[PDB]
Amino acid sequence: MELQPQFNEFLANIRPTDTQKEDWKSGARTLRERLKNFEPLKEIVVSTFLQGSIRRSTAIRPLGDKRPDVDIVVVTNLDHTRMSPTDAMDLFIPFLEKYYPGKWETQGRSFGITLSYVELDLVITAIPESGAEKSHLEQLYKSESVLTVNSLEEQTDWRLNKSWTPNTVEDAPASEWKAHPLVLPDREKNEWGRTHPLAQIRWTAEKNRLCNGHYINLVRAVKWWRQQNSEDLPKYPKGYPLEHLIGNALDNGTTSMAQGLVQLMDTFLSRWAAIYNQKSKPWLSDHGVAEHDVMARLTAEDFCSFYEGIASAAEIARNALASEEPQESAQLWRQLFGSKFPLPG
Ligand SMILES: Nc1ncnc2c1ncn2[C@@H]1O[C@H](COP(=O)(O)CP(=O)(O)OP(=O)(O)O)[C@@H](O)[C@H]1O
Ligand SMILES: Nc1ncnc2c1ncn2[C@@H]1O[C@H](COP(=O)(O)CP(=O)(O)OP(=O)(O)O)[C@@H](O)[C@H]1O
Ligand SMILES: [Mg+2]
Ligand SMILES: [Mg+2]
Ligand SMILES: [Mg+2]
Ligand SMILES: [Mg+2]
């Protein structure tokens, strides 16, 4: 059985809490305003915006006491050919000491800021374009479409368009943004790399519409499966490479979460069968920066162990979907997801 009310309750159980949500919305607004009014950075900071799994509504609630990771981009107008990633980051130390003393730390390519209930993950970026192109991009980064702190789940009317306004317009033509990534610090060395968070967000919103609202829920459900079965799965993939694998495997047109789960798992297994039999791993283009392999740091051994995990899970998911009794079907789904998936009343 599909058990759509049970899937809805399960999703409500694995979303971050309202306490966490209001903490990160207020934290993002406060950081943005403080940066806006900080005199040494006023002419440098273009935009401060929410990104990552939190923005795309693909984050799951942390277990126990833990604070969710909440990703923030600071867009600057710095010349990345004349200043290194650390030059740009150096600019923000006085600001952090003034407004977040004792609550911030450098974490390699980003700054961690400990709030009451969440952990901000701040990345400093720059716009590589110049002239009029740069001005047009800065206008996009200053628009409500970028500055909204509501997540995709809260505004299905969201589009990547400097003219979009919250409903109390489509995505802009791709030629205005698709080939225009930001630069950010590389993970382990003082060099600029490319990232296109806006394009990832837009791609996710569109995939979610193409899949009738089930995509971001399916991402969170599969993350929860991976967490619940972590003892039997490889450490990687997780986080964004896992999300990207799910978005790849899922077909357009999803009609329920049970159907979508079985479909995406079946498709994963068929699409990567040759790669698995070659003891390899796929090369998968990032939706933001096409020439980037989202799987670049994943080992072939981990991909193949994960493939074995998906094969085992797909058998369970098929049985749960095919089951004609609500209790038996829910028991099989709970074999996948654990006790946060409820039994029907
Ligand atoms: N291998 C990768 N390829 C492309 N983009 C990536 C990426 N790793 C991270 N990113 C981008 O940077 C954002 C922040 O990354 P992370 O915080 O490390 C994982 P996340 O997607 O936010 O899930 P999580 O923090 O809830 O576990 C990601 O959401 C993604 O937009
Ligand atoms: N916090 C973040 N915010 C935005 N984009 C991020 C991000 N973390 C990672 N990304 C994106 O994911 C891509 C891959 O990032 P990582 O997995 O950390 C390897 P890297 O930084 O490219 O170093 P490497 O070339 O030495 O492997 C980055 O290029 C960036 O596009
Ligand atoms: Mg994150
Ligand atoms: Mg992070
Ligand atoms: Mg790299
Ligand atoms: Mg697909």
XYZ file of C-alpha atoms and ligand atoms in Angstrom:
411
model
C 0.000 0.000 0.000
C 1.020 3.639 -0.586
C -0.058 4.824 2.908
C 0.122 8.494 1.983
C -1.159 9.810 5.379
C 1.510 7.739 7.123
C 4.195 9.115 4.797
C 2.971 12.650 5.538
C 3.225 12.056 9.301
C 6.674 10.463 8.855
C 7.816 13.558 6.943
C 6.460 15.808 9.696
C 8.506 13.719 12.145
C 11.793 14.078 10.217
C 11.650 17.773 9.243
C 13.672 20.138 11.447
C 11.615 21.481 14.324
C 9.787 24.800 14.394
C 12.179 25.910 17.155
C 15.164 25.222 14.901
C 13.402 26.840 11.931
C 12.634 30.118 13.660
C 16.145 30.139 15.144
C 17.806 29.935 11.722
C 15.409 32.400 10.047
C 16.038 34.963 12.794
C 19.761 34.161 12.766
C 20.001 34.708 9.004
C 18.044 37.987 9.167
C 20.194 39.287 12.020
C 23.458 38.329 10.321
C 22.300 39.975 7.086
C 21.330 43.229 8.826
C 24.528 43.364 10.895
C 26.608 42.891 7.741
C 24.509 45.531 5.991
C 25.312 48.081 8.687
C 28.984 47.187 9.350
C 30.908 50.156 7.935
C 34.118 48.371 6.811
C 32.066 45.832 4.794
C 29.158 48.009 3.570
C 30.613 48.570 0.090
C 31.881 44.975 -0.188
C 28.971 42.720 0.792
C 26.458 42.371 -2.049
C 24.082 39.877 -0.471
C 23.644 37.464 2.458
C 21.362 34.546 1.641
C 20.160 31.167 2.878
C 21.313 28.131 0.880
C 22.030 24.437 1.309
C 19.667 21.676 2.392
C 17.820 24.066 4.711
C 16.931 26.399 1.839
C 15.975 23.523 -0.468
C 13.903 21.794 2.265
C 16.098 18.703 1.913
C 17.398 18.798 5.503
C 16.409 16.220 8.118
C 16.152 16.807 11.854
C 19.386 16.009 13.724
C 19.253 13.233 16.287
C 19.327 13.965 19.994
C 20.630 17.373 21.057
C 22.437 18.238 17.847
C 22.124 21.583 16.046
C 21.216 21.575 12.335
C 23.790 22.803 9.846
C 22.394 25.970 8.229
C 24.289 27.190 5.164
C 24.649 30.919 4.389
C 26.351 32.571 1.397
C 27.929 36.002 1.718
C 28.256 37.456 -1.793
C 31.038 40.056 -2.133
C 32.167 42.189 -5.073
C 35.847 41.438 -4.418
C 38.233 40.880 -7.334
C 39.103 37.186 -7.070
C 42.054 37.596 -9.450
C 43.725 40.017 -7.011
C 42.646 38.653 -3.608
C 42.869 35.034 -2.417
C 40.021 33.194 -0.640
C 41.788 33.872 2.683
C 42.062 37.618 1.872
C 38.278 37.683 1.521
C 37.702 35.618 4.686
C 40.217 37.779 6.641
C 37.895 40.723 6.083
C 35.213 39.120 8.285
C 37.196 38.413 11.480
C 36.607 41.865 13.087
C 32.909 41.557 12.300
C 32.679 38.113 13.885
C 34.616 39.258 16.966
C 32.323 42.274 17.366
C 28.969 40.499 16.948
C 29.638 36.803 17.697
C 32.524 36.645 20.215
C 33.062 33.164 21.602
C 30.453 31.735 19.210
C 32.353 31.567 15.892
C 35.189 29.441 14.534
C 37.036 29.025 11.258
C 36.115 25.658 9.711
C 38.390 25.504 6.681
C 36.462 26.957 3.759
C 33.759 28.494 5.970
C 32.912 30.084 9.327
C 30.817 28.237 11.914
C 28.550 30.371 14.092
C 26.892 28.675 17.072
C 23.400 30.019 17.739
C 20.941 28.785 20.392
C 19.454 25.941 18.340
C 21.297 25.924 14.987
C 24.828 26.192 13.612
C 25.388 28.674 10.790
C 27.890 27.663 8.093
C 28.996 30.901 6.395
C 30.857 30.795 3.064
C 32.411 33.963 1.589
C 32.072 34.175 -2.202
C 32.772 36.594 -5.036
C 31.290 37.438 -8.447
C 33.791 36.698 -11.274
C 31.937 38.824 -13.844
C 32.646 42.508 -14.454
C 30.838 45.577 -15.736
C 27.193 45.389 -16.726
C 27.054 41.596 -16.337
C 28.249 41.998 -12.761
C 25.632 44.688 -12.084
C 22.824 42.463 -13.415
C 23.944 39.587 -11.214
C 24.197 41.873 -8.171
C 20.600 42.951 -8.851
C 19.540 39.290 -8.796
C 21.407 38.622 -5.520
C 19.662 41.652 -3.945
C 16.170 40.534 -4.989
C 13.488 38.992 -2.787
C 13.838 35.753 -4.771
C 17.345 35.401 -3.321
C 16.895 37.136 0.046
C 13.766 35.240 1.188
C 14.529 33.093 4.232
C 11.593 30.765 3.615
C 12.465 27.349 2.227
C 11.184 25.760 -0.992
C 8.572 23.796 0.953
C 7.066 27.010 2.362
C 6.787 28.831 -1.023
C 5.993 26.552 -3.949
C 5.401 29.791 -5.886
C 9.145 30.592 -5.640
C 11.010 31.233 -8.897
C 14.543 32.439 -9.619
C 13.583 35.862 -10.951
C 14.454 39.323 -9.699
C 10.773 40.240 -10.274
C 9.302 37.433 -8.144
C 7.408 38.515 -5.056
C 5.961 36.347 -2.269
C 2.311 35.492 -2.760
C 0.405 37.036 0.137
C 6.274 35.021 -13.063
C 8.512 32.128 -14.140
C 12.199 31.492 -13.644
C 14.212 34.111 -15.498
C 15.534 33.080 -18.931
C 18.431 30.689 -18.415
C 20.763 32.914 -20.436
C 20.692 35.459 -17.574
C 22.041 33.117 -14.858
C 22.882 29.547 -15.953
C 26.502 30.174 -16.990
C 27.274 32.498 -14.027
C 28.555 30.695 -10.918
C 30.035 32.354 -7.873
C 33.561 31.563 -6.692
C 34.156 30.207 -3.167
C 37.233 28.858 -1.299
C 38.336 25.344 -2.170
C 37.879 22.865 0.666
C 41.529 22.392 1.618
C 43.659 24.920 -0.290
C 43.736 28.693 -0.723
C 42.319 28.737 -4.275
C 38.997 29.861 -5.747
C 36.588 27.211 -7.034
C 33.167 27.551 -8.638
C 29.747 27.103 -7.037
C 26.242 27.945 -8.306
C 23.862 27.654 -5.323
C 21.079 29.633 -7.026
C 21.033 27.198 -9.961
C 20.929 24.220 -7.578
C 18.010 25.775 -5.680
C 16.126 26.528 -8.897
C 16.797 23.045 -10.269
C 15.473 21.523 -7.058
C 12.331 23.680 -7.042
C 11.646 22.724 -10.649
C 12.294 19.014 -10.055
C 9.908 19.183 -7.107
C 7.207 20.686 -9.346
C 7.904 18.083 -12.046
C 7.423 15.400 -9.362
C 4.212 16.851 -7.900
C 5.817 17.919 -4.629
C 7.267 14.505 -3.797
C 10.923 15.113 -4.645
C 12.134 17.085 -1.610
C 10.155 14.718 0.650
C 11.768 11.706 -1.044
C 15.212 13.242 -0.488
C 14.511 13.604 3.221
C 13.025 10.093 3.445
C 16.086 8.520 1.784
C 18.422 10.523 4.045
C 16.474 9.171 7.007
C 16.767 5.609 5.657
C 20.525 6.117 5.320
C 20.754 7.413 8.891
C 18.588 4.619 10.307
C 20.621 1.951 8.495
C 24.009 3.650 8.854
C 25.534 0.585 10.517
C 24.940 -1.434 7.323
C 25.808 1.295 4.790
C 29.079 3.011 3.852
C 29.837 6.388 5.403
C 29.527 7.987 1.962
C 27.512 8.997 0.075
C 25.615 11.293 2.438
C 24.507 14.908 2.419
C 24.598 16.607 -0.942
C 26.073 13.765 -3.075
C 23.256 11.580 -1.697
C 20.675 14.250 -2.545
C 22.096 14.510 -6.071
C 21.913 10.725 -6.550
C 18.253 10.798 -5.498
C 17.430 13.703 -7.816
C 19.110 11.843 -10.652
C 17.369 8.522 -10.001
C 13.870 9.959 -9.599
C 11.822 10.257 -12.820
C 9.636 13.248 -13.599
C 5.944 12.730 -12.896
C 6.050 11.053 -9.459
C 2.526 10.394 -8.159
C 3.147 9.247 -4.560
C 6.071 8.808 -2.208
C 5.728 4.978 -2.163
C 5.686 4.816 -5.976
C 8.531 7.331 -6.223
C 10.653 5.373 -3.751
C 10.260 2.096 -5.617
C 10.813 3.821 -8.971
C 13.932 5.730 -7.986
C 15.453 2.664 -6.328
C 14.682 0.449 -9.349
C 16.110 3.076 -11.701
C 19.231 3.549 -9.568
C 19.849 -0.181 -9.713
C 19.315 -0.500 -13.464
C 21.150 2.707 -14.424
C 24.280 1.920 -12.406
C 24.302 -1.871 -12.867
C 27.210 -1.740 -15.344
C 29.189 0.688 -13.181
C 28.626 -1.584 -10.182
C 29.735 -4.661 -12.132
C 32.832 -2.680 -13.137
C 33.555 -1.865 -9.455
C 33.487 1.808 -10.406
C 31.365 4.887 -9.711
C 29.447 7.293 -11.940
C 30.590 10.723 -13.082
C 27.610 13.016 -12.472
C 27.375 16.631 -13.637
C 26.501 19.169 -10.963
C 23.270 21.058 -11.671
C 25.021 24.302 -10.743
C 28.491 23.947 -12.299
C 28.171 21.498 -15.190
C 31.837 20.552 -15.458
C 31.959 19.498 -11.758
C 31.543 15.809 -10.842
C 29.325 15.700 -7.749
C 30.820 12.248 -7.024
C 34.441 13.441 -7.329
C 35.346 12.617 -3.703
C 33.242 9.437 -3.453
C 35.302 6.257 -3.673
C 34.311 3.402 -5.970
C 34.279 1.092 -2.952
C 31.763 3.288 -1.138
C 29.590 3.706 -4.231
C 29.445 -0.059 -4.734
C 28.671 -0.739 -1.040
C 25.912 1.860 -1.308
C 24.598 0.160 -4.457
C 24.355 -3.091 -2.486
C 22.452 -1.241 0.243
C 20.007 0.175 -2.312
C 19.472 -3.290 -3.789
C 18.566 -4.700 -0.385
C 16.317 -1.695 0.352
C 14.556 -1.924 -3.019
C 13.393 -5.464 -2.276
C 11.808 -4.214 0.974
C 10.274 -1.163 -0.700
C 8.726 -3.276 -3.468
C 7.180 -5.602 -0.890
C 5.860 -2.686 1.170
C 4.271 -1.111 -1.911
C 2.765 -4.395 -3.162
C 1.374 -5.355 0.256
C -2.419 -5.223 0.372
C -2.744 -5.021 4.183
C -2.111 -1.693 5.976
C -0.354 -3.141 9.024
C 1.942 -5.469 7.062
C 2.724 -2.699 4.570
C 3.532 -0.241 7.361
C 5.737 -2.867 9.016
C 7.772 -3.178 5.815
C 8.038 0.606 5.420
C 9.228 0.723 9.049
C 11.852 -1.865 8.171
C 13.151 0.869 5.868
C 12.642 4.004 7.966
C 12.339 2.891 11.585
C 9.820 3.927 14.193
C 9.262 7.509 12.948
C 7.101 5.963 10.213
C 3.763 5.395 11.987
C 1.494 2.401 11.970
C -2.007 3.135 10.640
C -4.712 3.498 13.265
N 29.809 17.576 -3.871
C 28.988 18.783 -3.945
N 28.654 19.057 -5.217
C 27.911 20.134 -5.495
N 27.474 20.954 -4.470
C 27.803 20.664 -3.202
C 28.551 19.596 -2.921
N 28.738 19.545 -1.580
C 28.094 20.587 -1.047
N 27.529 21.295 -2.046
C 26.699 22.460 -1.936
O 26.953 23.219 -0.571
C 25.839 23.127 0.142
C 26.208 22.936 1.647
O 26.832 21.687 1.751
P 26.763 20.842 3.128
O 26.268 21.710 4.263
O 28.106 20.281 3.432
C 25.632 19.357 2.795
P 23.853 19.910 2.685
O 23.370 19.729 1.280
O 23.625 21.319 3.182
O 23.107 18.838 3.679
P 23.307 18.862 5.317
O 24.233 20.023 5.732
O 21.885 19.027 5.842
O 23.905 17.523 5.695
C 25.126 21.868 -0.392
O 23.802 21.863 -0.077
C 25.422 22.060 -1.881
O 24.497 23.113 -2.379
N 29.389 25.485 1.780
C 29.320 25.355 0.322
N 28.577 26.341 -0.188
C 28.393 26.432 -1.504
N 28.952 25.499 -2.330
C 29.691 24.495 -1.821
C 29.890 24.404 -0.508
N 30.659 23.315 -0.263
C 30.934 22.742 -1.443
N 30.339 23.474 -2.404
C 30.365 23.208 -3.815
O 30.719 21.681 -4.024
C 31.771 21.619 -4.814
C 32.713 20.459 -4.334
O 33.152 20.826 -3.038
P 34.058 19.813 -2.135
O 33.406 18.470 -2.006
O 34.303 20.387 -0.791
C 35.701 19.504 -3.036
P 36.569 21.100 -3.520
O 36.274 22.280 -2.650
O 36.149 21.361 -4.936
O 38.188 20.815 -3.294
P 39.160 19.846 -4.202
O 39.292 20.447 -5.589
O 40.524 19.839 -3.537
O 38.541 18.431 -4.273
C 32.475 22.969 -4.597
O 33.230 23.267 -5.683
C 31.276 23.904 -4.474
O 30.754 24.133 -5.845
Mg 24.334 21.974 5.020
Mg 27.318 23.242 5.845
Mg 37.334 20.306 -6.408
Mg 15.891 11.414 -13.320
